[model samples]
Target: SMSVKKPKRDDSKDLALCSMILTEMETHEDAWPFLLPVNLKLVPGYKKVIKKPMDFSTIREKLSSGQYPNLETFALDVRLVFDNCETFNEDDSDIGRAGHNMRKYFEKKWTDTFK
Candidate 1:
């Protein structure tokens, strides 16, 4: 019999970046509701990290330096927040819709700010 191998999970790194983006989003009054609390029950340290004020410029600096590597990886981390939210809760479909909208907001932000 052959043994099967599983890929290593590196969600912590991705979550760090995602949490940072959510922290930035929370600064927006209109986007606050969608970004707040972060329901760490469904995720991890994101909520805990967001407890303190985050430095948005630092996040942008990391992004501009390509620490995250590419736009696709960064975007996936952003979308994963909403994907997780939309996954386990059907009662809060509004969150799902908000997630999609949030994704759009960041996509626009990426183009406008980064490009």
Candidate 2:
């Protein structure tokens, strides 16, 4: 009988792939606003609208910490990022355009890697 604790999920392969995606997103030119959690001082009434504040850094942290039980949960966070952005920024604004482009790229990349 095995004595070692069973992992909830084997994260090695998933971690690498997710890590790669995170890196690409972090390095992307449009990733500035999304690289870290929004500053409370900078954005007013943000939490009022965006109850779930998701960001790349936080996502990366959660990944390493086993917060992602599966890809579906992981995928949700990514979508939340863009969803919050769209909700806050005007379509004509820089951040709005950035989120739009970033979401497009991420969706294509996610499909390419997964399917």
Q: What is the lDDT of residue 20 in candidate 2?
A: 88
Query: Candidate 1 lDDT, tens digit per residue, 1-108?
Result: 268768755554554555455466656544543543444577665565443322334344556666676556666555555555455435356655666666677777
Q: Which number leads on lDDT? A: 2
Runs off by more than 4 Å, candidate 1:
1-24, 30-72, 90-92
lDDT of each: 0.54, 0.89
Candidate 1 minimal-lDDT segment of 10 residues: 51-60
lDDT, residue 21, model 2: 83
**Clashing pairs in model 2?**
none
lDDT per residue as tens, model 2, 1-109: 3787766665558767877887898899999989999987778989688889999999999988989988878889999999999999998999999999999988887
The residue-level lDDT of candidate 1 at 82 comes to 53
Candidate 2 residues lying further than 4 Å off, grouped into runs, are 1-12
TM-score of each: 0.41, 0.86
Error of 1 at 90 (Å): 4.1
